[PDB]
């Protein structure tokens, strides 16, 4: 049977599935760790223990235990990322889906979801893996991993939470795709890994950690690099936030094993309760438990390892959205709201700019507010809503990234940036979010070829360019089609630095994305904190 595979843990039985049509097989929930739960909370994972008969692969898993929004009850922008199942600390799964007939070895892709290392799913609906496996008939895999504190506690030196247990939950499941993979007719030699935001910082974490890069071929990141920085902390920090955590839950705090052993009687749902009680300042885009500069899974500073070239030299694609920071003003900054057009006044903005660049001194913050005013206009109450936009997306997304294309491109061999502007015709979010964080996921998944989701044709077509490149990319190592007539695609490069805009006009290149506010962040600001 073709829903009927073996594999080295046992036998798996898919589902048929609809898709444009059509029909595809799917695995839904095989298991690659063995349930986190209990006193292994925290703890590194385990090899899912090989079983007999036949594993029923029909359904999604469920979802790890996750803070969820209820920002906008009932709300589709917003539920749309929310666990869609049963949350479990019982949620170490993954997910395949298989073009039909099975293919012989073809191109596996994985993905590994965003939410800030706190949240995600992988059985979200924007997430189905159905329609890029049949569009280009790809291997689709989305694994799962431990968000939160389950994910992220770390206490430096213990082995009980050593800390970065999702990143090992991640290569644990790109682990079992190259042992696996095969017998789904994926071929293990070509498994490109992408994601997007955290899961895009992840990519680029694997891609950097030597213990996880002969896993895999080539990587996607779409909106985040790993030297964001909300996407790691050192190991004091992370020490100082988990006794923190233990602080919040009236727990012995003597040592490691008091602290460690109280964590773990405490229920999913306590964790998660004072979760945002431990960050250090009153932020907008920092989460509490994220990847530990350990000295093991990172070797050094991302720093030295992107300066040194220490990490996994292929090709790489990625880019970002036009108007990554609006979400996070949204739903922290003074003056924002859904329904208004958010026009911000001077005193907001600078609120604004205090709750964006947390870790700043005034003399930083009056900076980064000089940098993006416009003295001439500076009561626009459009222009202080915009200019905040762009500070947190540069400072959080466009310049790390930026700055991870260009020291990477050095040892590297190929690099394709983007620069990803069109906004969706059937957005819920208001419009002066623009082209909001995670809005070009459904491009990348699809969603536009199926009519009743309502996008306009020339967004299909959007779609299917972008779910090309990505196939034909990691396929290949090159977005572009071998002698296609269409516009090509060029790579990025030390000296020109060449990227592309993705939207439904005809394609245009340019040059340094976003340069002068990246030198900003990047050289200058760095450079006058430190001596501050
Ligand atoms: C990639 O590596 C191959 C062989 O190692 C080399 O010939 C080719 O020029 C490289 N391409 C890039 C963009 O570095
Ligand atoms: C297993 O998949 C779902 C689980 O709820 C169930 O509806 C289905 O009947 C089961 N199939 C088999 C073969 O066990």
Same mark, same amino acid.
């Given at each position: 049977?073709?829903?009927?595979?073996?594999?080295?843990?046992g036998?798996?039985?898919?589902?048929?599935?609809?898709?444009?049509?059509?029909?595809?097989?799917?695995?839904?929930?095989?298991?690659?760790?063995? &349930?986190?739960?209990?006193?292994?909370?925290?703890?590194?994972?385990?090899?899912?223990?090989?079983?007999?008969?036949?594993?029923?692969?029909?359904?999604?898993?469920?979802?790890?235990?996750?803070?969820?929004?209820?920002?906008?009850?009932?709300?589709?922008?917003?539920?749309?990322?929310?666990?869609?199942?049963?949350?479990?600390?019982?949620?170490?799964?993954?997910? =395949?889906?298989?073009?039909? &007939?099975?293919?012989?070895?073809?191109?596996?892709?994985?993905?590994?979801?965003?939410?800030?290392?706190?949240?995600?799913?992988?059985?979200? +609906?924007?997430?189905?893996?159905?329609?890029?496996?049949?569009?280009?008939?790809?291997? %689709?895999?989305?694994?799962?991993?431990?968000?939160?504190?389950?994910?992220?506690?770390?206490?430096?030196?213990?082995q009980?939470?050593?800390?970065?247990?999702?990143?090992?939950?991640?290569?644990? $499941?790109?682990?079992?795709?190259? @042992?696996?993979?095969?017998?789904?007719?994926?071929?293990?030699?070509?498994?490109?890994?992408?994601?997007?935001?955290?899961?895009?910082?992840?990519?680029?974490?694997?891609?950097?950690?030597?213990?996880?890069?002969?896993?895999?071929?080539?990587? =996607? !990141? *779409?909106?985040?690099?790993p030297?964001?920085p909300?996407?790691?902390?050192?190991? $004091?920090?992370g020490?100082?936030?988990?006794?923190?955590?233990?602080?919040?839950?009236?727990?012995?705090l003597?040592?490691?094993?008091?602290?460690?052993?109280?964590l773990?009687?405490?229920?999913?749902?306590?964790?998660? @309760?004072?979760?945002?009680?431990?960050?250090?300042?009153?932020?907008?885009?920092?989460?509490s438990f994220?990847?530990?500069?350990?000295?093991?899974?990172?070797?050094?500073?991302?720093?030295?390892?992107? /300066?040194?070239?220490?990490?996994?030299?292929? *090709?790489?694609?990625?880019?970002?959205?036009?108007?990554?920071?609006?979400?996070?003003?949204?739903?922290?900054?003074?003056?924002?709201?859904? +329904?208004?057009?958010?026009?911000?006044?001077?005193?907001?903005?600078?609120?604004?700019?205090?709750?964006?660049?947390?870790h700043?001194?005034?003399?930083? %913050?009056? $900076?980064?507010? !000089?940098?993006?005013?416009?003295?001439? +206009?500076? /009561?626009?109450?459009?222009?202080?809503?915009?200019?905040? +936009?762009?500070?947190?997306?540069?400072?959080?997304? =466009?310049?790390?990234?930026?700055?991870f294309?260009?020291?990477?491109?050095?040892?590297?061999?190929?690099?394709?940036?983007?620069?990803?502007?069109?906004?969706?015709?059937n957005?819920?979010?208001?419009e002066?979010?623009?082209?909001?964080?995670?809005?070009?996921?459904?491009?990348?998944?699809?969603?536009?070829?199926?009519?009743? !989701?309502?996008?306009?044709?020339?967004?299909?077509?959007?779609?299917?360019? =972008?779910?090309?490149?990505?196939?034909?990319?990691?396929?290949?190592?090159?977005?572009?089609?071998?002698?296609? *007539?269409?516009?090509?695609?060029?790579?990025?490069?030390?000296?020109?630095?060449?990227?592309?805009? %993705?939207?439904?006009?005809?394609?245009?290149?340019? *040059?340094?994305?976003?340069?002068?506010?990246?030198?900003?962040?990047?050289?200058?600001?760095?450079?006058?904190?430190?001596?501050?």
């Amino acid at each position: 049977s073709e829903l009927l595979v073996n594999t080295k843990s046992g036998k798996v039985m898919g589902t048929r599935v609809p898709v444009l049509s059509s029909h595809i097989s799917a695995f839904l929930g095989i298991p690659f760790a063995e &349930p986190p739960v209990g006193n292994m909370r925290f703890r590194r994972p385990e090899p899912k223990k090989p079983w007999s008969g036949v594993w029923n692969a029909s359904t999604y898993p469920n979802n790890c235990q996750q803070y969820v929004d209820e920002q906008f009850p009932g709300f589709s922008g917003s539920e749309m990322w929310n666990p869609n199942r049963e949350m479990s600390e019982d949620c170490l799964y993954l997910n =395949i889906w298989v073009p039909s &007939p099975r293919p012989k070895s073809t191109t596996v892709m994985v993905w590994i979801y965003g939410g800030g290392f706190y949240s995600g799913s992988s059985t979200l +609906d924007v997430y189905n893996g159905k329609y890029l496996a049949y569009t280009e008939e790809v291997v %689709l895999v989305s694994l799962s991993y431990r968000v939160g504190a389950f994910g992220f506690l770390a206490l430096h030196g213990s082995q009980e939470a050593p800390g970065n247990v999702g990143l090992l939950d991640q290569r644990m $499941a790109l682990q079992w795709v190259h @042992d696996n993979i095969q017998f789904f007719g994926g071929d293990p030699k070509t498994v490109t890994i992408f994601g997007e935001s955290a899961g895009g910082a992840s990519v680029g974490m694997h891609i950097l950690s030597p213990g996880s890069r002969d896993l895999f071929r080539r990587a =996607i !990141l *779409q909106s985040g690099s790993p030297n964001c920085p909300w996407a790691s902390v050192s190991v $004091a920090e992370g020490r100082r936030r988990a006794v923190e955590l233990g602080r919040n839950l009236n727990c012995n705090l003597n040592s490691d094993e008091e602290l460690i052993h109280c964590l773990r009687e405490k229920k999913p749902q306590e964790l998660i @309760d004072v979760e945002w009680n431990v960050l250090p300042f009153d932020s907008i885009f920092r989460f509490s438990f994220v990847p530990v500069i350990d000295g093991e899974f990172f070797p050094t500073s991302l720093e030295s390892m992107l /300066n040194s070239g220490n990490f996994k030299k292929t *090709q790489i694609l990625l880019g970002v959205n036009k108007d990554e920071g609006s979400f996070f003003l949204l739903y922290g900054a003074p003056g924002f709201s859904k +329904d208004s057009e958010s026009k911000i006044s001077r005193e907001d903005f600078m609120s604004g700019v205090k709750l964006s660049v947390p870790h700043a001194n005034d003399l930083g %913050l009056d $900076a980064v507010t !000089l940098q993006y005013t416009d003295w001439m +206009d500076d /009561n626009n109450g459009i222009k202080n809503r915009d200019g905040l +936009d762009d500070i947190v997306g540069d400072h959080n997304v =466009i310049c790390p990234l930026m700055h991870f294309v260009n020291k990477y491109t050095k040892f590297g061999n190929g690099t394709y940036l983007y620069f990803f502007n069109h906004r969706a015709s059937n957005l819920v979010w208001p419009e002066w979010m623009g082209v909001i964080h995670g809005y070009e996921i459904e491009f990348v998944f699809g969603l536009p070829l199926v009519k009743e !989701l309502n996008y306009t044709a020339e967004e299909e077509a959007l779609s299917r360019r =972008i779910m090309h490149y990505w196939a034909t990319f990691a396929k290949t190592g090159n977005p572009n089609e071998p002698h296609s *007539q269409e516009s090509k695609w060029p790579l990025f490069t030390t000296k020109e630095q060449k990227f592309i805009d %993705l939207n439904t006009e005809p394609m245009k290149v340019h *040059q340094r994305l976003r340069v002068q506010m990246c030198v900003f962040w990047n050289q200058f600001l760095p450079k006058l904190l430190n001596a501050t």
